[PDB]
Nucleic acid binder design. Structure first.
Lengths: 67, 185, 120, 260, 144
RNA sequence: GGAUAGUGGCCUACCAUGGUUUCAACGGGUAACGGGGAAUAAGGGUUCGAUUCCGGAGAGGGAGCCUGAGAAACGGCUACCACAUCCAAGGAAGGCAGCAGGCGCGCAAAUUACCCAAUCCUAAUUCAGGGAGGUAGUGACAAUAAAUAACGAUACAGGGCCC
RNA sequence: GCGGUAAUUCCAGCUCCAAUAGCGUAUAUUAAAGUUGUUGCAGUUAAAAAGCUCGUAGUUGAACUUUGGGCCCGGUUGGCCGGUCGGAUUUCCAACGGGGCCUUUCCUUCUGGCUAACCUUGAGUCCUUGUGGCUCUUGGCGAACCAGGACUUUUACUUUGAAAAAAUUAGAGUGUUCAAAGCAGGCGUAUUGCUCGAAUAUAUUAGCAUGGAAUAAUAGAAUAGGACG
């Protein structure tokens, strides 16, 4: 069999230069739990829709939805 | 867009499709060397036609110009290394007199039978496609291998492949356990 | 040619060479031809064309009557005509080894001289 | 179409980058820089096709961002940097000094030199002109303009310019019988002499080139580049020494050197 | 002699003469006026989906006699009513009224076959199957 | 002279009747984007090129214009025309010839999938983002490599010719 | 063309044939097609010489104007070569042009820039008796190359060169296990690495430098307003 291999001096510099998916392969980094990409772009759209700080709007819409 | 992977067909179908002579001649070829489909024969005659085309239109060039010299000596080198051309036929005229069975002789399909190993061309076919044939240290399962010069030495079995020792296989194993349970206990 | 000689002898009957085209691809009548017709032409005499015994024909009659068919059913079973089947019963016929082979492969009855009447 | 291309697909870059057809659509599209995108080569294809110090653009970016690659002496972190002709890409880590000079075939190959001669690059001038406050100046083909020249310099003369001083050192006045390095067309990357020189006044004047091994050819004059004195070039030269063997004797040299 | 002007400058005369004698080839004018995309019943297509209107008794030509069991269909895209043959045996009775069949050409570019007179076309499918499959009983028709 | 980035009938005033053409102008067709090329190939050729690259052109039809080095930008605006949406019937926002998806049209042509990891790109920029692009699924368009059994052991028949 | 009573063509079965993980169909372009013809058609009668002349375009058009190298070769006149009873030749041999070979191979010329090398001598030193041998110019040699000129009938033609994006195509290297493909890879001392590569051809008219001066047109000097000076 043939594969391509890397050895490192200074394991700190190794994980500096290392691709983090291989670090997850080696247990050297946590398998990152991020949202599905559809969910991330959708939250991004809500993020760019809500101008301001958001709770400035949430306060007044809660006020108006009260009555 | 990533570029098209260029590809081509590997043969030409014959132009007059029902000629009794072409039928019987290719039938002696196929039923002599165990050829599965006539795609095999037509691929061989296509390779022969391509070299025959370059040989005609290269032979038309004058002597001692480096195009004819270079492509000619390299073409003869390729035919020598495959082995269809004899060691002393090395001239740009003997290359066009090749028949089709001269290219069929250097198929590993045939080379297994010629070197022994099978008691048949057809047994050679089924053995190669069941992968007990390893050229040196590489198994092939291609019957149309178009074998080369030096590796005809290295035609033998595999470090696997129960003919090449090393842990016999399926039906032998089932019959071994079967006789062990039926006659031992 | 030693190796393919052993191969083709290991296959069915063959000859010392086996590369020459036998001809007439659905001429299934070449069992008796190539030696006998070129005898009878060369003879310039009279030859005796004879079928063997009507015991073969009555074996056909017994086997057909036991298998509950008729002559015409047997003819459309063997892809031949009622006349050739009927003459093969009633013994006014001439032999054809190919047709006798179809009668045996449809009936399973020995039509062969000494032994008569079992699927071999 | 409304403005400048920033993409450039593979099957459109020059062929002296020798990029495979696949594993992308795209080809690493030089930024603006000193050298033209037909005659330059980006650092990314330099490092990962020609030196094999990385496998990924991630990797090449980190490599340049560690501030070691001093392309003409200055640290470059730009992946899309057009490294081009007579370039002195040096390091500190492997302590190596590469000069971008061609092949016999026309390909920017590797040419590993010492620290000496890693301290000067050459350059053909392509216009010499007068500017502000009466100050003359001279151009090169990386676009290095230099004020206060030797007035002995004319156009089509070459200059040895160091790395950091500027400060025009030994130039070469152009005339007949000089070693030049033809860098275009099919005569790209062959070396010869200035056996004859011709002016077709108005369009595309030419120069006869005779190499060492008696092969005359005749090039245009934006492809000429003086590398110096007769048998005395100011820098080092690759294998082949810019001679362009015929293909049959090329095969013969390959086959003879193949094995002992 | 020979007619043509063999002159080393006579090529425009040569080429005009060729271009204007090309139309007597049946196929150069037939593409280049644009006659498939004008007045053949199809628009350069090979098959067209049609609607069945009528079942026709076209009786064969002189050295034959038979009633040929053709069908009279209308195109979808263009409105043309046109005869079409219903091929092999018993497959007339597989077609009823308005069965949206599929029309093909017939084997000679757009002339007839043998002894049906005047017909150009044929049916290959009825409402989305076939006729080979229906004739060999290897497919059963959906019911609309 | 103005306009323009700049030449220029590009436009304006003035002043001359010129310019093209049977060596095919002008006008009509086209199922006309062009070129790289593809097919078929003795040679000479003939047909095709919407399409993996360059150049063009367009963002429903048509013009105008801010911003900006660069757009007559439409994943920008304004006007009209054509088409259709949501309302509490007061009004408001529109652009798939981007990616999947749907309808119609048809002889007629895919997942409302996973992801910056590759190759590239963008920026304040190693990092963020990229339906560019990559990755699987559908997929007999095509193109290649080529399983459907090998080795035996077996028997019955005729019918020539020597006897 | 089969099918109108014993269908080698329909519908089935049996058997076979071919292409085979493919086979058929429709339609369209290509070859077949010397049935579009320039190579390369045909016109008495098969389709097809205008009723006949004139004639502008187009297409075409009689003849004529001299040649710097030699080595080898053969061919004709020829002379010292005439032997043979006016013919009978060899070759030490010119050239008469002719076929290959390396080159004479050049651009025709001033305006001088500048001279490579001198006709040498400016005398003798180093060293074998010294035209052996340089450091050198005062009487010579410009083309080895430069730019202000004048050579200037313009082309059509052909040779050569630079351009003739990448893929494609032809093809060189390479065991992608064969291969369609790709641009790779290959060897160790595999333990701290060596190295070849990724060619070449082709592309056209249109240009743009370059040689060739046959072919094919085109200008002269007649009512000498001519060149020479």
């Amino acid at each position: 069999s043939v594969g391509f291999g890397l050895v490192y001096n200074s394991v700190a510099e190794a994980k500096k230069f290392e691709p983090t998916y291989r670090l997850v392969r080696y247990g050297l980094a946590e398998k990152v739990e991020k949202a599905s990409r559809q969910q991330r772009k959708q939250k991004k759209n809500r993020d760019k829709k809500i101008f301001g700080t958001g709770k400035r709007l949430a306060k007044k819409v809660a006020r108006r939805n009260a009555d | 867009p990533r570029a098209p992977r260029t590809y081509s067909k590997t043969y030409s179908t014959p132009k007059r499709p029902y000629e009794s002579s072409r039928l019987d001649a290719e039938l002696k070829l196929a039923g002599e060397f165990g050829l599965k489909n006539k795609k095999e024969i037509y691929r061989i005659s296509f390779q022969l036609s391509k070299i025959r085309r370059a040989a005609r239109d290269l032979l038309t060039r004058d002597e001692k110009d480096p195009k004819r010299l270079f492509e000619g000596n390299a073409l003869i080198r390729r035919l020598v290394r495959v082995g269809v051309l004899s060691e002393d036929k090395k001239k740009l005229d003997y290359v066009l007199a090749l028949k089709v069975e001269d290219f069929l002789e250097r198929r590993l399909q045939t080379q297994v039978y010629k070197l022994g190993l099978a008691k048949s061309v057809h047994h050679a076919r089924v053995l190669i496609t069941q992968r007990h044939i390893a050229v040196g240290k590489q198994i092939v399962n291609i019957p149309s291998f178009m074998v080369r010069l030096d590796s005809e030495k290295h035609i033998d079995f595999a470090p696997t492949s129960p003919f090449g020792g090393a842990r016999p296989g399926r039906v032998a194993r089932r019959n071994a356990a079967r006789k062990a349970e039926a006659s031992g206990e | 040619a030693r190796s393919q000689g052993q191969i083709n002898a290991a296959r069915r009957q063959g000859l010392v060479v086996s590369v020459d085209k036998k001809y007439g691809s659905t001429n299934t009548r070449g069992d008796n031809e190539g030696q006998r017709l070129t005898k009878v032409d060369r003879e310039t005499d009279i030859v005796k064309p004879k079928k063997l015994d009507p015991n073969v024909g009555r074996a056909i009659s017994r086997a057909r009557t036991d298998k509950k068919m008729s002559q015409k059913d047997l003819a459309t079973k063997i892809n031949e005509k009622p006349t050739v089947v009927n003459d093969y019963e009633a013994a006014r016929a001439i032999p054809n080894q190919q047709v006798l082979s179809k009668l045996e492969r449809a009936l399973g009855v020995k039509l062969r001289g000494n032994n008569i009447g079992s699927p071999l | 179409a409304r403005g400048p291309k920033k993409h450039l697909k593979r099957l459109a870059a020059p062929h002296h980058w020798l990029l495979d057809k696949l594993s992308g659509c795209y080809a690493p599209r030089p930024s603006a820089g000193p050298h033209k995108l037909r005659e330059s080569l980006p650092l990314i294809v330099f490092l990962r096709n020609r030196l094999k110090y990385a496998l990924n653009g991630r990797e090449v970016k980190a490599i340049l961002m560690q501030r070691h690659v001093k392309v003409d002496g200055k640290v470059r972190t730009d992946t899309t940097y057009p490294a081009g002709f007579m370039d002195v890409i040096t390091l500190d880590a492997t302590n190596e000094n590469f000069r971008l000079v061609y092949d016999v075939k026309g390909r920017f190959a590797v040419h590993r030199i010492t620290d000496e001669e890693a301290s000067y690059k050459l350059g053909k001038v392509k216009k010499v002109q007068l500017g502000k406050k009466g100050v003359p100046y001279v151009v090169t083909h990386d676009g290095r303009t230099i004020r206060y020249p030797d007035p002995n310099i004319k156009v089509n003369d070459t200059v040895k310019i160091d790395l950091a001083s500027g400060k025009i050192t030994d130039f070469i006045k152009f005339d007949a019988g000089k070693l030049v390095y033809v860098t275009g067309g099919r005569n790209l990357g062959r070396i010869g002499t200035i056996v004859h020189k011709e002016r077709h006044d108005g369009g595309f004047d030419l120069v006869h080139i005779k190499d060492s091994l008696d092969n005359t050819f005749v090039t245009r004059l934006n492809n000429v580049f003086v590398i110096g004195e007769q048998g005395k070039p100011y820098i080092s030269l690759p294998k082949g020494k810019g001679i362009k063997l015929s293909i049959a004797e090329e095969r013969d040299r390959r086959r003879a050197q193949q094995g002992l | 002699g020979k007619g043509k002007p063999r002159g080393l400058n006579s090529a425009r005369k040569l080429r005009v003469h060729r271009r204007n004698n090309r139309w007597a080839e049946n196929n150069y004018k037939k593409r280049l006026l644009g006659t498939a995309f004008k007045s053949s019943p199809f628009g350069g297509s090979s098959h067209a989906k049609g609607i069945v209107l009528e079942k026709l008794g076209i009786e064969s030509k002189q050295p034959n006699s038979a009633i040929r069991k053709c069908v009279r269909v209308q195109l979808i895209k263009n409105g043309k009513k046109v005869t079409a043959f219903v091929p092999n045996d018993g497959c007339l009775n597989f077609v009823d009224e308005n069965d949206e069949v599929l029309l093909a050409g017939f084997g000679r570019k757009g002339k007839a076959k043998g002894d049906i007179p005047g017909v150009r076309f044929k049916v290959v499918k009825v409402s989305g199957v076939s006729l080979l499959a229906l004739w060999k009983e290897k497919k059963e028709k959906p019911r609309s």
